[PDB]
Amino acid sequence: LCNGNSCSDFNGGCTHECVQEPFGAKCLCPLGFLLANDSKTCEDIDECDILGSCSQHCYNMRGSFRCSCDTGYMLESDGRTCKVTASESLLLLVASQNKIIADSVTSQVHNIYSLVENGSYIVAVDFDSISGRIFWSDATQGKTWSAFQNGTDR
Numbered sequence: 001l002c003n004g005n006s007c008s009d010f011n012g013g014c015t016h017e018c019v020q021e022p023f024g025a026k027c028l029c030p031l032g033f034l035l036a037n038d039s040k041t042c043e044d045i046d047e048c049d050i051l052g053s054c055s056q057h058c059y060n061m062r063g064s065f066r067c068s069c070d071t072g073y074m075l076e077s078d079g080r081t082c083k084v085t086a087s088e089s090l091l092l093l094v095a096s097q098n099k100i101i102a103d104s105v106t107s108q109v110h111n112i113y114s115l116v117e118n119g120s121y122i123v124a125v126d127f128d129s130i131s132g133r134i135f136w137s138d139a140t141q142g143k144t145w146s147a148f149q150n151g152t153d154r
C-alpha cells in the first residue's frame with residue numbers, strides 16, 4: 001500500500017529478513033539491532049552507551065553487550081551486574097553532631113550503632129583498609145582522631 005512492498009519484491013533491500021507488510025516493505029531487526037532511516041537496514045545498538053548497562057566495564061557486541069567486573073567484584077547471573085567478592089558488610093559511617101553513627105545491614109540486620117560518642121563536632125570521616133582503622137576530624141576540637149573499627153584505640 002504505502003510502501004513499495006519491496007520486502008516482498010526483493011527482500012526490500014532490508015539488511016535483516018524483510019517483512020512484507022500490507023503497506024509494503026517493513027523489514028525487521030533482531031534484538032540489539034535498530035533500523036536505519038530507510039527502516040530497512042539494521043544497525044548495531046551500543047548498549048554500553050546507555051547508562052546503567054552494567055555496573056562495570058562494558059563491551060559492545062552485535063545485538064548484545066559484554067561486561068566485566070573488578071578483581072574484587074563478581075559478575076552476577078544476569079551478566080549485567082557486579083557484586084563485591086568479599087563477604088564483609090558495608091559500614092556506612094555517618095558523622096553526627098557529637099558522635100559517629102555507623103550502620104551494618106549484614107543479613108538484613110540494620111545494626112545502627114554509635115561507634116564513637118565522645119566527640120564535640122565531627123565533620124569528616126574516613127577509613128584505612130590496610131590498618132583497619134577509622135579516621136575522623138572534629139571541627140570544635142580541631143583534631144584528627146583515629147581508632148580501630150571496633151571503636152577502640154581512640
Ligand SMILES: *[C@@H]1O[C@H](CO)[C@@H](O)[C@H](O)[C@H]1NC(C)=O
Pocket residue numbers: 132148149150152
Ligand atoms: C580492634 O581490632 C584490631 C584489629 O583486629 C585489634 O588489633 C584490636 O586489638 C581490636 N581492639 C578491640 C579492643 O576490639
